[PDB]
């Protein structure tokens, strides 16, 4: 899972 930004600029698992 690559780190990606969510709506609030925070880290979330990316595809």
């Amino acid at each position, epitope marked *: 899972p*690559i*780190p990606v*930004l969510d709506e*609030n*600029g*925070l*880290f*979330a*698992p990316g595809p």
Partner: antibody
Amino acid sequence: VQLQQSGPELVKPGSSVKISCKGSGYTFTDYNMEWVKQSHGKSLEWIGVINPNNRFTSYNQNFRGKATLTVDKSSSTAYMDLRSLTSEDSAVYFCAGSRWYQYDYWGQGTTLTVSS
Amino acid sequence: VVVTQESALTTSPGETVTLTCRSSTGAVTTSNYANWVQEKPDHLFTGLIGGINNRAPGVPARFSGSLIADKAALTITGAQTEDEAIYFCALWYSNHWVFGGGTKLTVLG
């Protein structure tokens, strides 16, 4: 804004320690908590990051099996546990709050000394 | 992977000084989201620049970030005596940050 870290630690090789970083004066859940190791008072090494809302973590592969990041949303506190300690782990450890690929706040540091 | 900064630089009040941040992997890009962090005595760290050349809240307007050729750069436009400090850069490589060795900036104040 205050990122208050736990106080200095003197521990024996082989033990484990848990450093805490408690945020106040800001919205704890608006930031990731990142962790950094400062060796010799000079060089900085990134350890990892945790998002307090989803517990998503990314680690520097060099700290896998050394550092474990956790959070307690409720008490606006982030934790870093360092295990199987050796003298190479002696350092000053910093937490920092980040968002949008940017550091906004930094803790004061926690000195860890690993010695017999 | 290694991030390289000037060891030390000297400037005077009111002047422009430019600090640089090089990556061993090749050209620094915008997707390295270069951060600049100021270290003042007693382990006082202040984030200055991050994201895409974004000034952190409360940071004075004289600090700005950019790319210069293949490097990231921090420009202090009209340096102040209080800017004498150590400046670290950090670059993002997909899933981790790497810090440079820091630049000791003298501001002859």
